[PDB]
Amino acid sequence: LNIAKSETKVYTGEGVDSVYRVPIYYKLKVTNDGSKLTFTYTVTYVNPKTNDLGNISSMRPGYSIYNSGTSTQTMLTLGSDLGKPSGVKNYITDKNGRQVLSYNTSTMTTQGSGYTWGNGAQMNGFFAKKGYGLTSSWTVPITGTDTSFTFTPYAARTDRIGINYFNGGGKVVESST
C-alpha cells in the first residue's frame, strides 16, 4: 500500500593501480524513483569504507587516470524496460562527494550488448592526492518492470587504456531477468 517513493543502493569495489601499487576504489550509487534510474559513479584513491586516502604521496602531480574505457569494454548493459541513457555529466568531487569543478558532458553510444561513453574525463595526480574523485552521472528512463542492469567499473592510466585497474572483476549486477 504505502510504497517507497525511492530506493537507493550503493555498491563499492576495489582494484589495484599497477603503477603506484596502491588500491583504487569505485562507488556506484543507483537511485530508482519510479520514473528513472540515476547513476553516480566515482573512481577515487579514498577508501569509501573509512574515508581515508591511501598513501599516494609519491604520485606525480601530472599522472592521470580515466574512469571509462573506449570500446575497450562495455560499461553498462540495460534491461528491456529501461530507455536510452541521458548524457553523462563528468566532474571532480571532493572527499565528501561535493562537486569541485565540472568537465565536458559525454555521450553514450552502443555497443556491444550495451553502452560505453567517449570524450571521457580524467583526474590528474594533484587532485587524486587531495582525496578527490572522478565522478560521472547519468539517468535512464524506466518504462516497465525489467529494470535490471549490469555495470562494469573501469580505471586506467591515460597512456595505457588497455589495462583496467579493476580487471573486469567487481561487476555490479542488478536483477531481475
Author numbering: 202 to 378
The authors write:
The pneumococcal serine-rich repeat protein (PsrP) is an important lung-specific virulence factor that is present in 60% of strains capable of causing pneumonia in children. Pneumococcal PsrP promotes both biofilm formation through self-oligomerization and adherence to keratin 10 (KRT10)-expressing lung epithelial cells. In this study, the crystal structure of the KRT10-binding region of PsrP (BR187–385) was determined, revealing a novel fold distantly related to CnaA subdomains. While one face of the compressed, two-sided barrel of BR187–385 is created by an extended β-sheet that presents a highly basic binding groove, extensive well-ordered loop regions distort the other face of the barrel, forming a paperclip-like substructure.
A single BR187–385 molecule was found in the P4122 asymmetric unit, and a model comprising residues L203–S378 was refined to R- and Rfree-values of 17.7% and 20.1%, respectively. The structural deviation between the P4122-BR187–385 monomer and each of the three P43212-BR187–385 molecules was minimal, with root mean square deviations (r.m.s.d.) of 0.6 Å and less than 0.4 Å, following superposition of the P4122 monomer on the P43212 chains A and B/C, respectively. However, a single population with a sedimentation coefficient of 1.85 S corresponding to a monomer with a hydrodynamic radius of 25 Å was clearly assessed using analytical ultracentrifugation (AUC). We believe, at the present stage, that the formed pseudo-complexes are probably owing to crystal packing. The overall three-dimensional structure of BR187–385, composed of 43% β-strands, 2% α-helices, 17% turns and 38% loop regions, can be described as a compressed barrel with two remarkably different faces. Furthermore, inspection of the electrostatic surface of BR187–385 revealed the presence of a highly basic groove with a solvent-accessible surface area of 180 Å2 that could easily accommodate the elongated and negatively charged helical rod domain of KRT10. A substructure within this region takes a paperclip form with back- and front-loops formed by residues 268–295 and 305–324, respectively, which provides a possible explanation to previous experimental observations.
